Structures are given as C-alpha cells and as structure tokens.
C-alpha cells in the first residue's frame, strides 16, 4: 500500500489512477478488509487533514479519486462516524477550490457519498443536527454551516452546491457557462438529486438563510430555481434536470406515505414555497420529446424512477400520462433509448394500470377526442415488448426477452377465475407476502417433474397468452432477427416458467402433459440458415429439450426403438433431436481435435452440417489466439455446453437398447470435448451411467374475491395449522479413460464447480457398486481430498462453500461396511473433519452446517453401542450451533426419527432442547429475524414431546421479557419473533385457565413494556392475569405500528427488515383474531374489550385513538394489515364512526384506499349479520353506503347482509328509499343488473314501494335485457 500511496502525487493522471485502484483493491482482497479500509482511510485523510496548509493539486486529485473508489466498499476495527464526516467535510471544502479539476474530483466523490452512503454517515447527514451532535467562491450570503443544530447537514449541502454552481442569488437567472463549465453544472445537479433522494425537504430551501441586500435582490430565490436548467443548451444538463425531477417525485411519495398534501403543507409553512409536485410532470413530458437522444435516455430513466410511485399516489393520472408519452420512444434510432424504454415498461404493474384505466374516462380521449380505450397492456405487450424481439440489434432483443419475463406475473386480463377485477388482483398481490403462513415441510435432471404441480390459474392464463403471442410472431416471421428474438424469448420463458411445472400455460394441443410448439422449434434446426446463428441455435436446443422433457409422466410407458415412450407420436421428435445432438457434438469433436471431416453422429455427407462445421471452426480459431479466461459469452464453449446439457436431459428417456449400439461413439466424442467443457462432459458421463445401470426415469417409473384473499383464506389456513399443531455390464471399462481424466482434472483445477461434479461422479460410482480400492490405486485421491481440508480450515481455499457438502457426502458413502481391502475412512474420522471445520473457521451457515447435513441424514435415517455413541456426539455438535435455523431443521429430523424408534429417548431429548431454546429466546440469542427461521422454530415446537413444554412457567419467563435495547431494528425483530414463537405454543398446546393461573402465580406486571420502558429502551437505556396478558400483546401492536410508520425507508432499516416487521404484525394480528374469534379465550377477550375502552392509565400505555392514528396512516401503504386491524376492532366491539367513516370514505384515485374501502364495508357487513338485534348499524350502512353494498353484493358477508335486509320490513323500506335517492348512479348496465338482483327478494310488506320504483325509474332504459327483468319483477309484485 505504501508503494502505491507514493504515486498519488504524480503528474500523470494514469499513474494516479493505477495507484488509486491498486490501493483499494489490495485492501479489498486482504484478510483484514475492514482494518485495511480503516488504515487506508487514516493515511488518505492524513495526507490532506491539516487543511490550512496548501497541498499539491496532483495529490488532492489522487486522494479524492482513491476515496471515490473506496466508499462503495464501506457500504457493507471499522471506519468511525467522525472519520466519515471528515471525508464529507473535506469533500465540501474542495468544491470551493480555485482549480476546477479539483472541483470535478470533489463533486464525483460527493456523488459516490450519496449513491452508496456508508450507514453511520447516512444516519448523520439526515439527522436534525447530526454533525453538530458529535474561479473564486460564489457564495454571497449565509447558507448555514455543516455543524448547525436547527437542520440536517443535507440542507446545507444542497444550498452550497446550488449557490456555488447553479444559482446566482437572483430569481430565474442561470449562472454563465464561462463562470462554471457545463461538466461541473451536470455534476452539481446530479449531486443535488442524490441528496434529495436521502432528504427531500433539502430541495424546498430558500437559497440564503438570511436575505441578500433588498436593493440588488428584491425577491428571495429558492433552491427549486435549479429546475430552470431544463431549458439549458447542453443535453447532459437538461437530462440531469429531468433525473432531478424523477428523483424528487419519487422521494416525496416515499417520505410522505402518499400523504402528499399533509407533507407539502408542512414544508410550505416552513419555507414559503408555492412550488407543487405536479410542476415536475410537464418537465418530464417536454424532455421525452428532446431533440437529443442522450437527453431522451435520461428523461426515460427519470420516468423509470417515478412512474410506479405516481400510479400508487393521488397523482395516478399523471402516472398514466407518462406511460402513454414514453410509448413513442419504441421508434427511436438510439438503441440505448429502446433498452431504457424496455426496462421502464418492465417496472410497471399492469394490474394497477388496469385499475387506473377502469377509473379513467376523459384520459382515454388524449389530446384529440379519441373514441375507444387506451389498451395500454396490449400496446406495451404487442406493439413494444414483442415488437422489439424483431430488433436488428441483438442487445435490444436480449433486453426485450428479459422484460417479457418480468411482465408475465404483472399482466391483468378480464374473466380470470382467480381475480374478477383489478382491485382484487392488486389486493391478492399485497396480501401474498405479509399474510404468508409460518410453516415448514436417482436424482432426476432439470426440466422433469413427476409430482402434481399445484399451479396458480391466473399465472397459467397469463403465460398461455404470452406464449401464444410469441409463437404467432415465430410462425409469421418474415425476418431472421424476429425468428431469433422469439427463440430467445421462448428459451428464457421455459427457464423462468419451466414447461414441466406450467404445462397448461405451455399447452398448444399436441398430446390430446404438454410438448407446446416442439415441432415448430424442430423445423428451425432442420432449416438451412437458422443453425448457423450459434445463439439462436443453442436457444432452440434448450427449448426443444425442455418441451420434450415436459411430456414425461403422461408419455412414459412402463415398439422396439425408444421403448419407454408410450406416446409414439413423440418418438420422431426425440429421434430427430437426439441424432441432431450427436451430429453437432461430433462437429465439436472434429473442431477441438483439428481432424478434418471425411454412425448416428456422422455428418460428412450433409451440406447444412458442413456449413455449421465451418462456422464453429472459425469461432474456435479466434479462441485459440486470445486469453479472456473469465469470458462467459464465448460462443463455441456456450454452444458445446448447451449441446451436452440437452443430451444429458434427453438421456432420462433412454434405455440400454437405445444407447447400447451407440455409447462407444458418445464416449469417444466426450473424450474430445472434455478439455473444453469438463463439467458438462462429466454431467453427460453421469447420465450415460444412469442409462447403462437402469437408474434413470425411463427405467424407474412405476369466484374468489376480497373477503377471500384479505381475510377468510389467511384465517382458515392459520386456524387449521393451530389445530394440526396438537397431533451385461462389460461396458463399464469404456468409461475408465473419462473417469481417470475427471480424477486427474480434480487435482489440477481450481474450479469448484468441476470439483463438485467429480465428487458427484465418484459418489454415483460407489452407489453403482464400483470397486473404489482398484480405482484409487493406493488411496491417492482420498489423500488429496483430505489434504484439501488443511487449506479449507485456514481460509486459503477460495470458494470452499461449494465443495464441502459433496466431500462430506462422498466420505459418508466411502465409510460403509468393511468393503474392499479395508475400511478407507470411519465415521469417527468424518466427525473429526467436521469438528475441525467447526472449531475456529469462517461462518457456520456456509461451512460447518453444510458439513453436518450429510452426516445427520446418514446416522439418523439410513445407518449398536458405537453407533449410538457417535449419534450422541453429533447431538453435542448440533447443540453448539442451535442458534441457527438450519440446525433446528436438523433437530426436527432427529426428533422425528427418535419419536418412531424410542419414545423415552424422544422425551429426554425434547426436554434437553426446550431447556436450551427458552433461555436463548429470552436473551435474543436465536437467529430468527427471518420468516423462514420463524417457521422452522414454529415447526420444532410441534415436534418436541409435549411433556417438554408442560408447566408453562419456562415459556412465560421466556416470553415476558424486555430486549437489551429498542434502538436497533435487528434487536426489536429478534425480541418480537421469540414472543410470536412462544405465543403460538400457548394458544395451541395449552388452555386459557392453565396459562392465566401460572401468570397470576408468577406475578408478571402489565407495566413490563409501558411507554416509559419503551421510550428509555429506544434511547438505549437498558391486576388480573388476563389484563396483564392483554396489555403485553396490545403494547407490541403499538411498537410494530410505530416502527412500520415512523422508521425511514432506507436510512434506518433494510427492505428485508421492512417486510419482516409487516409479517410479524400480520402474525400478531392473526393471533389476536384467533384469541377473540375462537371463543376458547373468553377471559382474555373480556380483558381486551376493557383495555380498548380505557385511557392509557394516564400516559403509561398506548390508547385506542393513538393506535388508530398509526393504523390510519398505513391505509395508503399496507392495506392488508389495516384490514386485519378492522377485524380486531369489530371483535372488541369498537364501532365508532371516527374510524369507520374514514376507512369506508363515507360521503357527506388510490388503489390501496379502494382495497381498504371495500374490505372495511365487507367486514362491517359480516359484523352486523351477528348483531341484527341492533338497528343503528343496519340503518347507517343502508343510508350512507347503498351504492357500495350493491357493487359488493357478490361478496358472501354483503350477500348475507342483503338477505338480512330482506327479512326486515323497515330495513327493506330504507333500502328502497336509498336506491330511490341514488338511482342516477345505478343506471349503468352492470349496476342496474346488481340493483335488480338485490330488489328481487325484497320484503312482502314493501311490494307497493318497490313496484313504484320500477315504473317511475327502472322500466325505461335502452338496455332491453334489464327492462325485461324489471317487467318480470314488477309483474311478480302485482301478483303478490
């Protein structure tokens, strides 16, 4: 490092660049990476830190560049906040330098500080006093200082950048391009954008904190005058201003929780800004129409940053307007504008667009009074994404194929069985993650599936339509590029949605599991030109193999060629593909050996294959004279790899009479191909052994809606799970050269993927009963594998995470019996290797746990005092790692195996595990800050002997605990996760009077997590039993709601942490619903009903109105959780219109508001059906919500409400009167139909009233089908 730091003063920019890159790279590949980043950061700031001394400009540039390469490696002893603010302060200082080449280097450093902020610096720069709590200069007034207490450092930073480079201090004036160069103006605009992403209110500042003189400056200038750079002469400056608009729009909609008018109102009172969020959209629109393609690419990137948050907001019409206005860019001459459009369109959720399109009326008309619909999905799918599969640039085709795969899950179509409307389609998407249940519980080749797949119908329908569209363009293809793009798209679709899983999506008709369009793809590889494009050809082979693999469990039998095929229509397709594969592999065998061309693989007499030989000979000739050894896109290796892969796949359908005339030709080809693709050649040898030994598949065969998705299906799945919680071979000598090549290659290579495959080959050879002591002449290979552990333990073997599980599986097999000359290795030695890698190495989840998983599966499933001793030693190794969920999955296995072999061993071990687990949970020592880990812990508590959990005291003393702090998200999540794990045991394995008696006898206090305890723990400063229990759960709700609403989205928590908070709250609220709805927890229910009506015992506890203020803020952002809160409010009889009139939007858009609006009315209908003795809530729904009741009348609880209205004379009278006061909104065909379906059953005593409504209002319409239904219902009422 000293040798390279010495070059940071060089006059040569190249020498400085080599030095800066080499210095950070040496740190990045050291053992002590974080110590060397701290040491380098000591040296680099040491070179400039006495800032009053004038330093060399060359050294300033060398040091600023080295920091710019270093700060992405700090994003994650270790670098301190005080040292990181010195980098930031030093960056601010150098923006005021005389030489503007140093200003460029400082702005480029500042751009990396804001693009990848180190977390301690990020907390500091956004905090309200964060740093203060630890040619010439153009600044002409007070812009504050970096150390101020009244405002966050980013407010000063944006002012400094603006006043130095963009704004003169005079309103609407741009700084001259002779005063500051356009390169610096572009860097400054983009640094403001990167600051606004972290802290939006930095944009709304008045430029000067105290005014300039009012004689020269009669009006104050705002920072937001930087949006005048949208009309500047330079393309990059206009584009950087469009990027600023996109980042600004997005960030306001994320920092406000779509509560824009409230957030903007606060900022307007603080600053005086008349500026609006809507003012940015015409700046994006004018810049998509820019004359320069570089500006246009940047305006497209700006729309990609804000389009979806606009669609989710109260500005959702402007979201549609931007989606429309980008479509014209499909016709752009610049390929980078075409790919940016494809990446933009791939972000869009067309379910949400379908909701917005259905609400729109005038937006369908555009500027020119158009007649018909926008049809945005059809235009994006057909006229952009599938249209750009025909693009002459392969780079645009590749992006269009990837964008299509991202779109299949997001498409909406009418008449779908899974979702009748797009509000149901958005609701089921949002519910799918937060309401996921906490649950857990000879190898076939890829693309085969024997078990029944339980696929989603909506996804099969979306995929069916996409594959049909891409297959139509392939059939009607008049251009080579469109043929190639459709094959790439189908090949990638068959990977992202496997044909054997999604057989109905891939159904074109031929076998009446599917073979899709296999004959269409086989036509291409017989054609004269298509085989000569190696990319399109390898895509056709992969797609053809996938389509023919997906027939298997309906095409398999039990004629003399391909005996295993019972569907004899597929044998021509399989023989065509197989003979093609042997010809193209023989072409590679000839090219790799340099042997000139001149029986199934014979090709010397076919012109189409001789052309392919000369294409492949040319591609290999360039490889011979180059050294790009990391290049994955090398087309000869790529082609040969795909051919060997598709051959390995088709061999699952073969048997010894197909291959026995042919195996020696295939092994001869593999012997030549082995040096170029050793790994895929080894996979082919393994499949070719599975065909010789009868071990392959050919020889070893033989109406839903919003109530449903938001509540009833989650609830039913949860309650059912809590209920379940209480319960001829002479040919082997042909393989010998290729096995010896694989053994030799293992001892020379560093490729862990090759080594992993050679271990899988040897494991398969010992299972196929090959004599290991004759194959490994003197234990040489096993000796080399044992020598590898010395380098793996010391951390000197790079990618050893991949090799460990295959070594342990191979050693476990090689230990069996006393076979051959002697036992080669024993389980005692395998335990000593595993305790060696466990002792002092790197992280358990990548090293010691992969080593244990083989040993545990052998000794507890497959493998007496010596054995039982070794099993007890493995249990002591597992108990040393019990904090990790992967070893709780190993404990589920050992418990399930001891439960069947011996119940007294199962009871003892279950007590031993519970006595270790419950203290660890009490102290947050379990690694359970994940949905999968919490599901594994929930499953272990069902598999433990129920005597282990029997006196609930140990569960209660582990549950009723505080964390050591509430200042960090990881700590709060671990704590709540342990509580949710224990709460599930209490409500499924124990009874209310057992739990409540043991709570009273242990004297737990409701004040355990009072607001005073919570507030001190957030600073980091470490009488009935039913009331005690209800306060504890109702405090955890307030903690989760506060952390979900208040915590800043990227500053304070990860995206994985944000969803796990929501999943914890979903699990907690689902428990509270089971407690209050089951009737099995009657005392806890009565206590919760009292608590929800209380004052907070003064300030001691969360009140219902304070919990509702957080839950009301979640409406726009977490509608699935808000609907579970609505359900709890009805279970505790909270029926105050100060909640219900808000969530139901009662009269006197946003899709998430509509989901809550409909869900809330449905839940309230389900309540009043249980409360028909009460008149007021029946009347209130009818008088205020008649239109919404009729629109939702298909949802079962609203149907039951309408049937309750029919049974009551006065209520049926109000229903008619309410229809009579809204019939002008009901006049639409679908609403009039729903209205008449409601009125058909109306009470007999109201027959003159409903008949009067029919003749006066409903009988006169152009809709003849409805006027006939009115006539029939009117005749029945006169007959009555």
């Amino acid at each position: 490092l000293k040798a390279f730091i010495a070059n940071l003063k060089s006059s040569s920019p190249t020498i400085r660049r080599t030095a800066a890159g080499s210095a950070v790279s040496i740190c990045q590949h050291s053992r002590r990476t974080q110590y060397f980043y701290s040491w380098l950061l000591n040296v680099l700031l040491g070179l400039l830190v006495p800032v009053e001394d004038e330093h060399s400009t060359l050294l300033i540039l060398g040091v600023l560049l080295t920091l710019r390469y270093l700060v992405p490696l700090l994003q994650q002893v270790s670098p301190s906040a005080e040292q990181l603010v010195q980098v930031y302060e030093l960056t601010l200082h150098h923006t005021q330098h005389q030489d503007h080449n140093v200003v460029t280097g400082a702005l480029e450093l500042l751009q990396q500080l804001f693009r990848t902020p180190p977390p301690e610096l990020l907390q500091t720069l956004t905090a309200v006093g964060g740093i203060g709590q630890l040619k010439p200069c153009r600044i002409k007034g007070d812009i504050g200082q970096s150390t101020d207490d009244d405002s966050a450092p980013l407010v000063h930073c944006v002012r400094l950048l603006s006043a130095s480079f963009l704004l003169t201090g005079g309103k609407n004036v741009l700084v001259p391009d002779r005063d500051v160069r356009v390169s610096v103006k572009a860097l400054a605009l983009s640094c403001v954008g990167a600051a606004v992403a972290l802290h939006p209110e930095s944009f709304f500042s008045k430029l000067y904190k105290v005014p300039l003189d009012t004689t020269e400056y009669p009006e104050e200038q705002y920072v937001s005058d930087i949006l005048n750079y949208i009309d500047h002469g330079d393309p990059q400056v206009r584009g950087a201003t469009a990027i600023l608009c996109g980042t600004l729009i997005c960030s306001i909609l994320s920092r406000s929780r779509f509560h824009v008018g409230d957030w903007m109102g606060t900022i307007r009172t603080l600053t005086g800004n008349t500026f609006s969020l809507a003012d940015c959209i015409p700046l994006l629109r004018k810049t998509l129409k820019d004359e320069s393609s570089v500006t246009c690419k940047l305006a497209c990137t700006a729309v990609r940053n804000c389009v979806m948050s606009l669609c989710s907001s109260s500005y959702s019409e402007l979201g549609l307007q931007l989606i429309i206005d980008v479509l014209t860019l499909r016709n752009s001459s610049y390929w980078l504008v075409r790919t940016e459009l494809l990446e933009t369109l791939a972000e869009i959720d067309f379910r949400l667009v379908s909701f917005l399109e259905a609400k729109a009326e005038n937006l369908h008309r555009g500027a020119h009074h158009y007649t018909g619909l926008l049809k945005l999905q059809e235009r994006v799918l057909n006229n952009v994404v599938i249209h750009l599969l025909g693009d002459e640039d392969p780079r645009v085709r590749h992006v269009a194929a990837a964008s299509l795969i991202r779109l299949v899950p997001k498409l909406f179509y009418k008449c779908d069985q899974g979702q009748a409307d797009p509000v149901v389609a958005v609701a089921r998407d949002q519910s799918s993650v937060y309401l996921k249940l906490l649950m857990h519980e000879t190898r076939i080749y890829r693309g085969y599936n024997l078990l029944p797949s339980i696929t989603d119908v909506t996804m099969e329908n979306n995929l069916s339509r996409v594959i049909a569209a891409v297959s139509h363009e392939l059939i009607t293809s008049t251009t080579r590029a469109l043929t190639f793009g459709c094959c790439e798209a189908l090949c990638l679709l068959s990977t992202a949605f496997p044909v054997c899983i999604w057989s109905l999506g891939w159904h074109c008709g031929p076998p009446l599991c599917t073979v899709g369009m296999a004959t269409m793809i086989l036509t291409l590889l017989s054609s004269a030109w298509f085989p000569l494009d190696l990319s399109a050809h390898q895509d056709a082979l992969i797609l053809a193999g996938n389509l023919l693999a997906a027939s298997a469990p309906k095409s398999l039998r039990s004629e003399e060629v391909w005996p295993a095929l019972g569907d004899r229509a597929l044998v021509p397709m399989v023989e065509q593909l197989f003979s093609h594969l042997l010809k193209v592999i023989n072409i590679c065998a000839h090219v790799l050996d340099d042997v000139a061309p001149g029986s199934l693989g014979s090709f010397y007499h076919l012109p189409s294959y001789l052309k392919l030989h000369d294409v492949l000979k040319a591609t290999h000739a360039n490889y011979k004279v180059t050294l790009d050894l990391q290049n994955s896109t090398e087309k000869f290796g790529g082609f040969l790899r795909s051919a060997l892969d598709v051959l390995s796949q088709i061999l699952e359908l073969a048997t010894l009479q197909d291959i026995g005339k042919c195996v020696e030709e295939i092994l001869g080809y593999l012997k030549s191909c082995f040096s170029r693709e050793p790994m895929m050649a080894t996979v082919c040898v393994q499949q070719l052994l599975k065909t010789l030994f009868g071990t392959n598949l050919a020889s070893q065969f033989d109406r839903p809606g919003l109530y449903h998705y938001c509540f009833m299906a989650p609830y039913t799945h949860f309650t059912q799970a809590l209920a379940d919680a209480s319960l001829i071979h002479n040919h082997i000598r042909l393989f010998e050269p290729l096995v010896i090549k694989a053994l030799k290659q293992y001892t020379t290579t560093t490729c862990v993927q090759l080594q992993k495959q050679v271990l899988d080959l040897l494991a398969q050879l010992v299972q196929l009963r090959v004599n290991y002591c004759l194959l490994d002449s003197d234990q040489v290979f096993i000796g080399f594998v044992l020598k590898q552990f010395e380098y793996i333990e010391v951390g000197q073997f790079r990618e050893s995470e991949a090799i460990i599980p295959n070594i342990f599986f191979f050693l476990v097999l090689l230990s069996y019996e006393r076979y051959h000359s002697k036992q080669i290795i024993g389980i005692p030695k395998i335990i000593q290797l595993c305790d060696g890698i466990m002792a002092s190495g790197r992280k358990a989840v990548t090293h010691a746990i992969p080593a244990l998983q083989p040993i545990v599966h052998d000794l507890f499933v497959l493998r007496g005092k010596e054995l039982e001793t070794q099993k007890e030693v493995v249990v002591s190794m597992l108990l040393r790692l019990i904090q990790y969920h992967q070893v709780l999955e190993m404990f589920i296995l050992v418990l399930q195996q001891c439960h069947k072999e011996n119940e007294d061993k199962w009871k003892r071990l279950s007590r031993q595990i519970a006595d270790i687990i419950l203290p660890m949970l009490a102290k947050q020592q379990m690694h359970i800050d994940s949905h999968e880990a919490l599901g594994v812990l929930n499953t272990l508590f069902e598999i433990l002997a129920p005597s282990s959990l029997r006196p609930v005291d140990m569960l209660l003393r582990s549950m009723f605990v505080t964390p050591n702090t509430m200042a960090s998200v990881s700590t709060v999540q671990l704590w709540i996760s342990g509580i949710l794990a224990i709460l599930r045991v209490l409500i499924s394995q124990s009874t209310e009077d057992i739990v409540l008696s043991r709570i009273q006898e242990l004297s737990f206090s409701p004040y355990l997590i009072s607001c005073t305890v919570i507030n001190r723990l957030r600073d980091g400063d470490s009488n009935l039993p039913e009331e005690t229990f209800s306060r504890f759960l109702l405090q955890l709700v307030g903690i989760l709601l506060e952390d979900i609403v208040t915590k800043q989205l990227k500053v304070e928590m990860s995206e994985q942490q944000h969803t796990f908070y929501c999943q914890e709250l979903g699990t907690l609220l689902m428990c509270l619903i089971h407690i209050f709805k089951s009737g099995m927890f009657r005392r806890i229910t009565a206590a919760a009903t009292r608590l929800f009506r209380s004052d907070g015992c003064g300030g001691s506890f969360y009140t219902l109105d304070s919990l509702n203020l957080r839950a009301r803020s979640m409406i726009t952002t977490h509608p699935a959780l808000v609907l579970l809160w609505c359900q709890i409010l009805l279970l505790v009889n909270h029926t105050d219109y100060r909640w219900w009139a808000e969530v139901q939007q009662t009269p006197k858009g946003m899709c998430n508001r509509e989901i809550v609006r409909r869900g809330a009315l449905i839940l309230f209908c389900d309540y009043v059906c249980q409360n028909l003795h009460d008149s007021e809530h029946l009347t209130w729904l009818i008088v205020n919500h008649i239109q919404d009741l009729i629109s939702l009348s298909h949802e079962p609880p609203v149907q039951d409400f309408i049937s309750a209205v029919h049974r009551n004379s006065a209520a049926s009278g109000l229903f008619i009167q309410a229809i009579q006061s809204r019939c002008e909104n009901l006049s639409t065909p679908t609403m009039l139909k729903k209205t008449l379906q409601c009125l058909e059953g109306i009470h007999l005593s109201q027959s003159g009233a409903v008949l009067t409504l029919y003749v006066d209002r409903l009988l006169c319409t152009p809709f003849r089908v409805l006027a006939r239904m009115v006539d029939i219902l009117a005749c029945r009422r006169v007959e009555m």
Binding site: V49, V51, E89, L92, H93, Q96, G132, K140, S146
Partner: peptide
C-alpha cells in the same frame, strides 16, 4: 466567504 466545519476548522475562501 467563511465556512465552519467539525473536523476541519473555520476556513476562508476568496470571493
């Protein structure tokens, strides 16, 4: 023009 920092001192730039 004059600035103030935490880890750097108070510094002056030539307007």
């Amino acid at each position: 023009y004059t600035a103030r920092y935490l880890t750097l001192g108070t510094l002056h730039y030539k307007c």
